[PDB]
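Progress narrative, Year 2. Work on Staphylococcal nuclease from Staphylococcus aureus advanced from sequence curation to structure prediction during this period.
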Amino acid sequence: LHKEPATLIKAIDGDTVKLMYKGQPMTFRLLLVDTPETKHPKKGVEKYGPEASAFSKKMVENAKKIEVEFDKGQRTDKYGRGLAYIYADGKMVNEALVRQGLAKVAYVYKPNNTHEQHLRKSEAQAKKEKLNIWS
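Result:
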């Protein structure tokens, strides 16, 4: 796997960000994580949704560098979103959300599962520390 440069366009939700990638605007969905959402009238603004969303927003907004890392399998989903690990100054946003108890590890689809172990390890720690979602 390799990281590539991208430029923030707009943070959209805890688990979705819009980036400039290879000169085209594109919506990215964060691989392997489920955050509570703000956007979906199914329930509306779930609990910790505003919080997960504020966290991803600040993280990508205050970064000097954003990089995207595609996994080994398909790189877009049925809605046309890029499927990727997102990095803000070297730190994986997907991991940080999970480390903070602001996201769970999603259902995993091989072969898009390279960082699955790492994330599950952070999730176990957040649970143990009873952070946010695990409170």
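The domain at 1-135 is CATH 2.40.50.90 (OB fold (Dihydrolipoamide Acetyltransferase, E2P)). Residues 61 and 96 are 15 Å apart (CA to CA).
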